[PDB]
Amino acid sequence: MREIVHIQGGQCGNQIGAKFWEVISDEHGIDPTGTYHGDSDLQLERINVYYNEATGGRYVPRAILMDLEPGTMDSVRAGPFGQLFRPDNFVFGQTGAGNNWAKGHYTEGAELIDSVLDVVRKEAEGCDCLQGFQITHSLGGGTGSGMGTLLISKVREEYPDRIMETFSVVPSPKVSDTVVEPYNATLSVHQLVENADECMVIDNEALYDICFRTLKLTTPTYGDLNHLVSAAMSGVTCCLRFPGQLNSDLRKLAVNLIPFPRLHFFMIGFAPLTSRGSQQYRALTVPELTQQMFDAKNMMCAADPRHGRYLTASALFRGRMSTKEVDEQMLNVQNKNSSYFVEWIPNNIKSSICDIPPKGLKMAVTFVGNSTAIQEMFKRVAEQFTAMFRRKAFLHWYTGEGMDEMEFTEAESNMNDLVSEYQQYQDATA
Amino acid sequence: MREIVHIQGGQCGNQIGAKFWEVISDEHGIDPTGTYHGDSDLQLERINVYYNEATGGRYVPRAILMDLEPGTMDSVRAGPFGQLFRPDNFVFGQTGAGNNWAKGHYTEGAELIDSVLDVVRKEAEGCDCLQGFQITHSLGGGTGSGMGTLLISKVREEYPDRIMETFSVVPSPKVSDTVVEPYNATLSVHQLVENADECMVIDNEALYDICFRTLKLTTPTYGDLNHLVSAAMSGVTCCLRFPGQLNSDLRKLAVNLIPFPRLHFFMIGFAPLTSRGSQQYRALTVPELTQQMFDAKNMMCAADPRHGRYLTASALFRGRMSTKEVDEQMLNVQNKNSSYFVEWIPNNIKSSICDIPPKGLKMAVTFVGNSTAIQEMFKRVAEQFTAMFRRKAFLHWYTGEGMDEMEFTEAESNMNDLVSEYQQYQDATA
Amino acid sequence: MREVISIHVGQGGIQVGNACWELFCLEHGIQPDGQMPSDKTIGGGDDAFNTFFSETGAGKHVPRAVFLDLEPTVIDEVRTGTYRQLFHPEQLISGKEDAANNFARGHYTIGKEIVDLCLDRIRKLADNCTGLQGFLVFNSVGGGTGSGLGSLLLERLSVDYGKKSKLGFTIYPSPQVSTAVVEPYNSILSTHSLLEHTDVAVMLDNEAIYDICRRNLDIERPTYTNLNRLIAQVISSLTASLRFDGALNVDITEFQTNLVPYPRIHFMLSSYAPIISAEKAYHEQLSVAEITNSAFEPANMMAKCDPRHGKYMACSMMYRGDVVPKDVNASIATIKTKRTIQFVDWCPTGFKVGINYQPPTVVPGGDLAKVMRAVCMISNSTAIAEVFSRLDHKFDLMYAKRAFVHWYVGEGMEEGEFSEAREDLAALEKDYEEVGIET
Amino acid sequence: YVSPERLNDLELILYEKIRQKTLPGEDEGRTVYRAFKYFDIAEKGVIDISQFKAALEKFGCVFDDKEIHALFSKFDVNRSGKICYDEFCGNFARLGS
Amino acid sequence: CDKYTSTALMGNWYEERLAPNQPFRENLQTKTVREEEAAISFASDLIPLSRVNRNLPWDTKGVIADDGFKEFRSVNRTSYDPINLNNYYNLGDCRQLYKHYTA
Ligand SMILES: Nc1nc2c(ncn2[C@@H]2O[C@H](COP(=O)(O)OP(=O)(O)OP(=O)(O)O)[C@@H](O)[C@H]2O)c(=O)[nH]1
Ligand SMILES: Nc1nc2c(ncn2[C@@H]2O[C@H](COP(=O)(O)OP(=O)(O)O)[C@@H](O)[C@H]2O)c(=O)[nH]1
Ligand SMILES: Nc1nc2c(ncn2[C@@H]2O[C@H](COP(=O)(O)OP(=O)(O)O)[C@@H](O)[C@H]2O)c(=O)[nH]1
Ligand SMILES: [Mg+2]
């Protein structure tokens, strides 16, 4: 019951989704062949959340795999667990993106979106009752931001009462990946606010920083980076698939994490994550474990959180933990760091519990936070756009496929508004 | 007990029947030699519907195969299941039709329709109580159009108390296969409407459309097209041969699908259908069966069923299913899409159930519906016919058998009114 | 012929019941199967399980309970759990979508599709019952579903049955420890409805329970189930006098007519003791004298509000065990003289005494041991105004700029209802101030 | 004692009903496999004849203890007095494809 | 692996000696991973998507390795643990006045 659909987009996304289905398959115990080899009885009571049922006893993820270039989708099928996806759930074009927004959201994407749009509705009505949406895409890339966001608006149109989330790798200037990144980013953030309820950015810059500082593996590669983010959403929906003391669905975070209708930008993090050589030496207690969660560098986003003040926080403890330790530890953290939390909202740390922890750990925490420190992320992206926009560079491609600078002017207007408005509360006093 | 004789003529006509006997024999499990090797008793109880009794316990199917050119018959008996048809039944000439309507109905047929009417009479008298006739022929084809059309004209005049069916293939505009199609095609509808109580159009485009889209076969041959239509014929005569929850003979289907004496044109669709590479990635559930039923692409007729409003509909499920599920789903679809069902006759779809599913599956649906959307097929065919006539092109062939322009001029008029009458009963409200 | 019906709504109530009903089963001797263990019962309690159970016709038993929760997560676990066979299979209304801590959500759009079933089940349960004495309602207000369903359900119950009494064991947010930040809104909204439909209520804040767990049982890391166990003990001690013989019985009807000065002020805060484990007791005290002193100790109180900050109006103390009568008068006389705990001017006699014979019973594998008697006390003192003062301060700060207002406003709850709730709550605080003014 | 060609007939009625209780889009093995794991507590794969009485008692079928022993024993090939759920459920899926 | 080939106490040497294996990095040439075939499905543009040689998956095990903890039990069940209750049943009064075995 209350099953959730999953949507994929863009090459950056395609790598997230395939590995994301990696973690769930084992925990539920569905093998590469789709047959069951579970151990605990409690593992099937809510298998229907992410998996349908079909004749022959085999299960298939209720997924949507979607991108504009055949090469990307080829890897997922030929790779591990490529046999779990229904062929009818795949949609692809033939022209590719080439890092052009217009080719993704007006001309090329529109002609093929109708095929992609139709697919979701058929699956959506099949389930007993939709509970939400999760979209795996990227903003700094070609196909995703343009052709991915459009599907965001279209889905939201017919289903005004269903909440949704989004995962996005917003770009960081340090490790540059494209010259045209500022355009397709700021253009993307414009439309995300008006319809996307929940969005938690993931910064690739933190991935290396988190990997070398704490993980400290010799030569981390794209295999591992996608893996750590995988657990983030694995525990986000924890309450739905296992029993617990205080169940918390997706919306509970929505009510308790977004003080105002528009301010819906979250930064997430995961713990514990310890090196391959320090595995057996750290005590396993709420006290030690909770210290890592709020650490400055444990956050998964390039934004440094200590530079600003938090508004609301919710972390879902997974596994058998004595709640009192959860409650008491919450008070101590909220007192010794008062200066980093806005005053006018009292009692602003949420808690949750569950019964089943991820395999191989008795503790597990997925921290979701709504901190003002995200402004620097937009500020860093926004400032480059104003500098490069004034020269009209790289502008002939966009204007030649249905994009008029009259539209671009508005986009910068929205970005500054959020940047300016967001920081009113940081200095606001009761 | 209401045994039905099967009559099919024409080169195209022979091929479809060449297989339709193939599948039907498999359902009752009669071997090529015709000796019974079935499995259960239910497969043998009502065997009298198609096969008669002869020496040795084998059966001779009640087929009267006719054609005007020897090319067809020499190959019909050359393939698998070429020993069931009796030697005496075949009647064929040594001249050929040459894709001309005239030579197939006035000059050559006049001296050869005597024999065909001879055998047809003998078979009917044999039946304990004839329940109806089933006819398969191709309108665009030469011999089928002429010899086939005349047979309906004569047969009606001797046995007015029996129902007639008609599986017809009318050439479409896109897939062109004959340059003289407009003339002989038009004469078909005029002669066909006034006599044939029932007709089910089957456009070649859909058969190609079904294969290239759903089944996903790289290089379909004409063999595939025959099977899909052949299976559909199996559905209509389903309950009349096996037990079931609610019997549904041939007349009952007519009672629920011919609102007025004239509107007697149907459009059929067959489900389920999925590729061999997608068989194991799907679920066989009553909800899934119903959805594909009303989807436009599933139907084998060029007319788009979303451009009009249905007048009546029928459903014939197969296998063991819950009665309540049949009712609840049937009510739901008609409710959510009122705009696509007319408003002056509620309960606008009929249902039936049988307890013997086709071999190889567990649940399936056969649809025989009458929609105002069928007006497209004649409107496009008529449009081309007028263009040819105004230039008196290719006319000298038709004038060479005694026919005058009077029959041509009238044909346009009657085909005009049948176009008109569909219009009247569609755009009219309480 | 003197029976009661239980109402449980919300996950918190479900969890508390999971222990309350198990203890109820243990004390009367009923197995989870519904079949009594025989063991030469020969009607040992005879007419004993009427107060909380009814005959199934032959053999088994069916507890008089109704379970409500819009989230099936806990309902399914209770269904397939340790007591699979006990509750009525169709008496467990199962929800479809969680309230997600939205009071407006739980009161005006989704709630209207399950109150009908709740009323139907309550009607069926009561009609068969002959002498329905009142209602027992457990609910949580620190979230959406609890209040959103319970307040509306009680509202409908009052118009359906009328003057019949009702008691409610709510759980308000703690002064320091809590889960959600939208809890103040739910508390403010729920108090509005509950201040004019329920007669007797008890606050059972979690912070005091944690404190009591740390001090006595010597279990530094308590659990939610362990916390629920004490509430179950309190309920059992409160309702014991209604189904067992005693020297002086106090029926459920003799609480409101004994412990509420006026129609408006009807909130009481209670405690339970002694709380001694199976390790550090048998070498200890529990002469009848010390229990009464421990009852009035401030730190032992089940609510984080010091009774020392106000006067007293009326407290009813029910002894369970083998307490000889005169000990009760001795304890009352000793407590009265001490200047630490003082009374209000207008109530000279404000103690209620009730003696029952059954000693409190313990569940296996718990933290509680078996002692020969204990005392449960219910108190309503002017100090309770402090808790409503503190819940007041939180709401104003975050309503100054309509924080999180949209989730409620767009859901149907008119913006004007917040004005009403705040005005009424402010009215309540004024109420308690005047009653304490000396004559 | 009775084991005529009537015990298998109950199997159809026993099977016919199973599809009745089966949730949409499910196989009788799925519905039954859950049942044998719900009442049971040993989890080693066995229960007594009474427990198997409880398991089928939920289905709604009404039989005497004599017939009950018939199917268990008929389903007890080894005579060990215990029933294994793996073989029981899998065999049913064979007949009800 | 600091500008060297391990086995030498270069900077940050303690970890790399414990690598699982990572078969991809030591066999760049075998490739293979050709198991998609011309399925003719997933999909048709009727031409199937061209199948390309995919390389090694690159191991994994980024998340903390199994600590020998299967777990997979519900909090509630152990709370009441119906095993606890029965022990307070059909038992007790045990002081072993004489010798006698039992379950
Ligand atoms: N001591 C204790 N407190 C509980 C328990 N369950 C819920 N609570 C309290 O309830 C508060 C949160 O609301 P809940 O009771 O969990 O749920 P709700 O208010 O009914 O709203 P929902 O979350 O939809 O169920 C927490 O802060 C707890 O203090 C419990 O089992 N034991
Ligand atoms: N951290 C991380 N980033 C990725 C990964 N795959 C893609 N990206 C990011 O995605 C961006 C490219 O987007 P792209 O796939 O070309 O967008 P598209 O053309 O619309 O499909 C690059 O800047 C990368 O930073 C990955 O596995 N890990
Ligand atoms: N769908 C389908 N159509 C066929 C097949 N064989 C022949 N036809 C059609 O029959 C037409 C030729 O008809 P014709 O042989 O002149 O009919 P006849 O004069 O009655 O023998 C062609 O245009 C084809 O479209 C077949 O196997 N499948
Ligand atoms: Mg809840």
Contact A78 E66 (CB under 8 A): no
Other CB atoms closer than 10 Å to residue B63's CB: what's the count? Answer: 19
**Ligand at shortest distance from the CA of A142:** 2
Q: How, if at all, do strands C373-381 and C312-321 pair?
A: antiparallel
Measure C154 CA to ligand 2 centroid, in angstroms. 56
| Chosen domain end from B374, B389, B414 | B374
Same domain, residue pair A326 and A230: no
Closest CA to B200 of B253, B247, B147, B249: B253
**Ligand at shortest distance from the CA of C142:** 1
Q: How, if at all, do strands C5-9 and A165-168 pair?
A: unpaired
Q: CB of E44 within 8 Å of any CB in chain B?
A: yes
CA distances from A104 to A381, A392, B359 (A): 21, 21, 47
Measure C13 CA to ligand 1 centroid, in angstroms. 8
Question: What does the DSSP assignment read for A310-322?
Answer: EEEEEEEEESS--
A249 burial level (CB within 10 Å; 0-12, 13-18, 19+): buried
A10 burial level (CB within 10 Å; 0-12, 13-18, 19+): buried
d(C-alpha D83, C-alpha D40), whole Å = 11
Region at A360 (left for phi over 0; alpha for psi -120 to 50; beta for the rest): left
The protein residue with its alpha carbon nearest to ligand 2, atom 2, reads A204
Q: Phi, psi at residue A340, to the nearest 5°?
A: -100, 15
A188 lines ligand 2 (CB under 6 A): no
Closest CA to C365 of A321, E88, A324, E95: E88
**Residue A74 with chain E: CB contacts under 8 Å:** 36, 49-52, 54
Ligand 3, atom nearest to B104 Cα: 19
Q: Which residues pair with C54 in a beta bridge?
A: C62
Contact E35 A78 (CB under 8 A): yes
Contacts of C289 (CB under 8 A, 6+ apart): C327, C330, C331, C334
| Tokens (6 digits) for C124 | 């069926």
Same domain, residue pair B143 and B13: yes
| In contact, C391 and C172? CB cutoff 8 Å | yes
Residue located via tokens 């230039």: B391
Contact D27 A57 (CB under 8 A): yes
Residue-range definition of the domain harbouring residue A361: 265-374
d(C-alpha C29, C-alpha A417), whole Å = 68
**CATH (domain of A368):** 3.30.1330.20
SS3 per residue for chain C: CCCCEEEEECHHHHHHHHHHHHHHHHHHCCCCCCCCCCCCCCCCCCCCHHHCEEECCCCCEEECEEEEECCHHHHHHHHCCCCCCCCCCCCEEECCCCCCCCCCHHHHCCHHHCHHHHHHHHHHHHHHCCCCCCEEEECCCCCHHHHHHHHHHHHHHHHHHCCCCCEEEECCCCCCCCCCCCHHHHHHHHHHHHCCCCCEEEECCHHHHHHHHHHCCCCCCCCHHHHHHHHHHHHHHHHHCCCCCCCECCCHHHCHHHHCCCCCCCEEEEEEECCCCCCCCCCCCCCHHHHHHHHCCCCCCCCCCCHHHCCEEEEEEEEEECCCHHHHHHHHHHHHHCCCCCCCCCCCCCEEEEEECCCCCCCCCCCCCCCCEEEEEEEEEHHHHHHHHHHHHHHHHHHCCCCCHHHHHCCCCCHHHHHHHHHHHHHHHHHHHHHCCCC
| Tokens (6 digits) for E28 | 């760049």
**Any idea which residues of C carry the catalytic annotation?**
254
B304 lines ligand 3 (CB under 6 A): no
**Ligand at shortest distance from the CA of A323:** 1
Contacts of C103 (CB under 8 A, 6+ apart): C144, C147, C148, C185, C186, C189, C190, C408, C413
| In contact, A243 and E75? CB cutoff 8 Å | yes
At position A425, the amino acid (one-letter code) is: Y
| Tokens (6 digits) for B295 | 């989807």
CA of residue A122 relative to chain centroid, distance: 24
Q: Which fold has domain C3-267?
A: Rossmann fold (3.40.50)
Task: Give E95 to chain C, closest Cα distance, Å.
Answer: 19
Domain assignment present for A422: no
Chosen from D27, D34, D39, D92 to mutate, greatest number of chain A CBs within 10 A = D27
Q: How, if at all, do strands C267-273 and C373-381 pair?
A: antiparallel
Q: How, if at all, do strands B364-371 and B266-271 pair?
A: antiparallel
| In contact, A240 and A316? CB cutoff 8 Å | no
Q: How, if at all, do strands C267-273 and C312-321 pair?
A: unpaired
Domain assignment present for A413: no
C138 burial level (CB within 10 Å; 0-12, 13-18, 19+): buried
Q: CB of D25 within 8 Å of any CB in chain B?
A: yes
Task: Identify the H or E element spanning B169.
Answer: strand B167-169
Residue of C nearest to A353 (CA): C179
d(C-alpha B335, C-alpha E93), whole Å = 71
Neighbours of chain C (3+ CB pairs under 8 A): A, E
Between residues 343 and 362 of chain B, which touch chain A (CB distance below 8 Å)? 362
Question: What does the DSSP assignment read for E40-83?
Answer: S-S-B---BPPP-----------SPPP-S------HHHHHH-HH
Q: Phi, psi at residue C107, to the nearest 5°?
A: -125, -15
Domain assignment present for A250: yes
CA distances from A139 to B43, B186, B271 (A): 62, 59, 42
| In contact, A352 and A317? CB cutoff 8 Å | yes
B266 three-class SS = strand
Contact E63 A228 (CB under 8 A): yes
B10 lines ligand 3 (CB under 6 A): yes
d(C-alpha C316, C-alpha D96), whole Å = 67
d(C-alpha B349, C-alpha B362), whole Å = 23
CA of residue B135 relative to chain centroid, distance: 7
Give CA angle at B152 (B148, B155), nearest 5°: 125
d(C-alpha C400, C-alpha C404), whole Å = 11
Q: CB of D25 within 8 Å of any CB in chain A?
A: yes
d(C-alpha C436, C-alpha C343), whole Å = 10
Domain assignment present for B132: yes
Cis peptide leading into B220, omega within 30 of 0? no
| In contact, A126 and B292? CB cutoff 8 Å | no
Give the domain ranges of chain C. 3-267, 268-386
Closest CA to C146 of C192, C196, C111: C111
d(C-alpha A149, C-alpha A139), whole Å = 9
CA distances from A308 to A303, A371, B337 (A): 10, 7, 54
Ligand 3, atom nearest to B13 Cα: 20
| In contact, C413 and C103? CB cutoff 8 Å | yes
SS3 per residue for A8-69: ECHHHHHHHHHHHHHHHHHHHCECCCCCECCCCHHHCCCHHHCECCCHHHCCCECCCEEECC
Other CB atoms closer than 10 Å to residue A282's CB: what's the count? Answer: 12
| Chosen domain end from B323, B358, B374 | B374
| In contact, E33 and A80? CB cutoff 8 Å | no
**Residue C11 with chain A: CB contacts under 8 Å:** 246-247
C299 burial level (CB within 10 Å; 0-12, 13-18, 19+): exposed
At position B121, the amino acid (one-letter code) is: R
d(C-alpha D65, C-alpha B321), whole Å = 32
B317 three-class SS = strand
d(C-alpha D85, C-alpha A182), whole Å = 61
CA of residue A299 relative to chain centroid, distance: 14
d(C-alpha B411, C-alpha B190), whole Å = 6
Closest CA to C33 of C65, C3, C62, C66: C62
d(C-alpha A74, C-alpha E50), whole Å = 8
| Tokens (6 digits) for A284 | 């396993």
Same domain, residue pair B227 and B276: no
Whether the CA torsion B28, B29, B32, B37 is positive or negative: it is: negative
Ligand 2, atom nearest to A177 Cα: 23
Closest CA to A188 of A12, A430, A330: A12
Q: How, if at all, do strands A130-136 and B63-67 pair?
A: unpaired
Whether the CA torsion C335, C336, C339, C340 is positive or negative: it is: positive
Same domain, residue pair B243 and B280: no
Q: Which of B8, B11, B174 to mutate to test the pocket of ligand 3 (most atoms within 8 A of CB)?
A: B11
Q: CB of A284 within 8 Å of any CB in chain C?
A: no
Closest CA to C354 of C262, C237, C201, C261: C237
**Residue B275 with chain E: CB contacts under 8 Å:** 40-41
**Residue E42 with chain B: CB contacts under 8 Å:** 277
Q: Phi, psi at residue B66, to the nearest 5°?
A: -135, 150
CA of residue C3 relative to chain centroid, distance: 18
Same domain, residue pair B100 and B24: yes
Total residue length of chain B: 430
Q: Phi, psi at residue E4, to the nearest 5°?
A: -145, -165
d(C-alpha E63, C-alpha A358), whole Å = 10
Q: Phi, psi at residue C168, to the nearest 5°?
A: -135, 125
| Chosen domain end from B348, B374, B400 | B374
**Ligand at shortest distance from the CA of A148:** 2
Same domain, residue pair A224 and A273: no
| In contact, B416 and B190? CB cutoff 8 Å | no
d(C-alpha B137, C-alpha B153), whole Å = 14
d(C-alpha A368, C-alpha A350), whole Å = 10
Measure C140 CA to ligand 1 centroid, in angstroms. 6
| In contact, B401 and B142? CB cutoff 8 Å | no
| In contact, B21 and B84? CB cutoff 8 Å | yes
Provide the number of structural domains found in chain A: 2
Rg (CA), chain B: 21
**CATH (domain of A245):** 3.40.50.1440
| In contact, B203 and B377? CB cutoff 8 Å | yes
| Tokens (6 digits) for B242 | 């096996």
Q: How, if at all, do strands A265-271 and A364-371 pair?
A: antiparallel
B421 three-class SS = helix
Measure C12 CA to ligand 1 centroid, in angstroms. 5
Question: What does the DSSP assignment read for B204-257?
Answer: HHHHHHHIIIII--SS--HHHHHHHHHHHHHHHTSGGGS--SB---HHHHHHTT
Instruction: Answer whether C3-267 and C268-386 agree in fold.
Output: no
d(C-alpha C315, C-alpha B25), whole Å = 91
Ligand 1, atom nearest to C231 Cα: 1
d(C-alpha A65, C-alpha A10), whole Å = 9
Same domain, residue pair A251 and A283: no
Same domain, residue pair A290 and A198: no
Closest CA to B4 of B129, B148, B151: B129
Other CB atoms closer than 10 Å to residue B66's CB: what's the count? Answer: 29
Domain assignment present for B192: yes
d(C-alpha C5, C-alpha B413), whole Å = 82
Q: CB of C15 within 8 Å of any CB in chain A?
A: yes
C12 lines ligand 1 (CB under 6 A): yes
Same domain, residue pair B243 and B278: no
Contact B218 E41 (CB under 8 A): no
d(C-alpha B83, C-alpha B104), whole Å = 29
Measure A319 CA to ligand 4 centroid, in angstroms. 18
A239 three-class SS = helix
d(C-alpha A205, C-alpha A226), whole Å = 13
A302 lines ligand 2 (CB under 6 A): no
Contact A251 C210 (CB under 8 A): no
Measure B389 CA to ligand 1 centroid, in angstroms. 84
Contact D24 B287 (CB under 8 A): yes
B318 three-class SS = strand
Q: Where are the alpha helices (DSSP H) in chain D?
A: 7-21, 28-38, 49-59, 65-75, 85-95
Same domain, residue pair A305 and A221: no
Domain assignment present for A282: yes
Resolution in A: 4.1
CA of residue B87 relative to chain centroid, distance: 25
Contact C364 E85 (CB under 8 A): yes
C74 burial level (CB within 10 Å; 0-12, 13-18, 19+): buried
Other CB atoms closer than 10 Å to residue D19's CB: what's the count? Answer: 15
Give per-residue burial for B405-422: e unless 16+ CB within 10 Å, then b. eeebeebeeebeebeeeb
Contacts of C149 (CB under 8 A, 6+ apart): C9, C10, C68, C70, C99, C106, C107, C111, C114, C115, C118, C139
Same domain, residue pair B64 and B126: yes
Same domain, residue pair B141 and B89: yes
| Tokens (6 digits) for B372 | 């105002």
Ligand 2, atom nearest to A68 Cα: 21
Residue of A nearest to B281 (CA): A86
d(C-alpha D42, C-alpha A305), whole Å = 52
Domain assignment present for B427: no
Domain assignment present for A406: no
d(C-alpha A208, C-alpha C381), whole Å = 60
Neighbours of chain E (3+ CB pairs under 8 A): A, B, C
Give CA angle at C234 (C230, C236), nearest 5°: 115
d(C-alpha A111, C-alpha A116), whole Å = 10
Q: How, if at all, do strands A310-318 and A364-371 pair?
A: antiparallel
Q: CB of C26 within 8 Å of any CB in chain E?
A: yes
Residue of A nearest to B279 (CA): A55
d(C-alpha A364, C-alpha A369), whole Å = 16
d(C-alpha C412, C-alpha C423), whole Å = 20
| In contact, A292 and A271? CB cutoff 8 Å | yes
Q: How, if at all, do strands B364-371 and B315-318 pair?
A: antiparallel
Domain C268-386, CATH: 3.30.1330.20
B385 burial level (CB within 10 Å; 0-12, 13-18, 19+): buried
